[PDB]
Symmetry: C3
Subunit: 154 residues, 3 copies
């Protein structure tokens, strides 16, 4: 629900090990990032963090915004949110992405697609392949490493 | 049918207003431009300016060129033209473009497709969404702000 | 035995991109035309500085072929192997044999260059097969810009431009 946890921790972190220290919700961006990636920023409608986003049009008084969604309305993938300005960082669907995305509440090689709420689910229109299994961060919060490369063909 | 108007105006322009000054036909490129965008150039066959283009092949003596077109042959979007060299600047369909494009003689949010002449029309195989109403520059020339983000 | 050895060397060197081979003479190629029709040619005829290029461990010999992702027992990371159809992931534009690393351009980025063809005139529609070879026609926008050039009794290359997916 938030990039940074709302409640402050009561304990320090044990910074000794180096394994399995990347399965956190505050892991913004992608696991493998190219210097030739196209990155945009939009006004955020809701909390579309780590979800497929779509274009949301108001009454014309205010500019275009982005909200979590999928299906035929999918426009990109949100990889970061600046909360002070409400700015959602979006990687366009034309550009391929590899990273941790929210999964609907799954094995490597299974084909995934974005549902109505911008959540990955097992399969049609979007090329997404899971590179790992679901990792549970909360009772309803599951993340999964996936590679999204364009849109499929009907 | 030229980016730069041929008939030079008889009056000086008044630079007093900062609103509604970009709704001209000589506004080449895009409104939102990324420094990592891929930009190609090709020989132009006709005037494909501000239209969707397709690859056209000749007899074989000369190289391939780009001509205004759509359908399943759509290759990219022509954003600029150098008239001296007849060189059309193309953004491939694999790259996403946001800018003013020619509309066939539509409200923000309407899905659009490219016709046989590279003109956007209201609706199948291209992701084009109108971001503004049709602005009429000439009695037959209409433009529209559209974001293209690939195929469907 | 040695003749069979030499025959296998010939086969594997024809398979390879730039095999090591000593020559008794200095071959002279003074003309500057049709000098680029070699198997050791660079990945792209027209290359942009904004192209996204990845590298992956290779399974088999996917050079100048369409590549797809493949997974094993999970002990080792995913690897690219020659393939096409609906499983196509990218195009292998280079290979480094010492490190066994295939340099690949994803299907989300348009590519133009010489690719392996099935054993064709310009302006024809091409599709990737199960082996990653191009064949005359589909779900990929691949168009041939030239005719098939034959370098070996089974090796054909063709100049092709591939730009994204083809809806419907």
């Amino acid at each position: 629900l938030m990039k940074n946890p709302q409640q402050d921790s009561g304990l320090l972190s044990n910074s000794i090990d180096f394994r399995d220290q990347n399965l956190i919700f505050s892991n913004s961006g992608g696991v493998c990032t190219s210097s030739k990636d196209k990155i945009e920023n939009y006004p955020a409608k809701g909390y579309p963090y780590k979800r497929g986003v779509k274009l949301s049009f108001g009454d014309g008084t205010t500019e275009l915004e982005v909200e979590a969604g999928g299906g035929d309305d999918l426009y990109g993938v949100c990889s970061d949110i600046d909360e002070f300005s409400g700015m959602a960082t979006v990687i366009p669907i034309t550009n391929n992405f590899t990273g941790y995305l929210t999964l609907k509440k799954v094995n490597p090689g299974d084909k995934l697609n974005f549902n109505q709420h911008g959540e990955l689910e097992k399969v049609k229109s979007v090329n997404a392949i899971a590179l790992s299994k679901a990792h549970k961060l909360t009772e309803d919060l599951f993340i999964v490493l996936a590679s999204v490369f364009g849109n499929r063909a009907i």
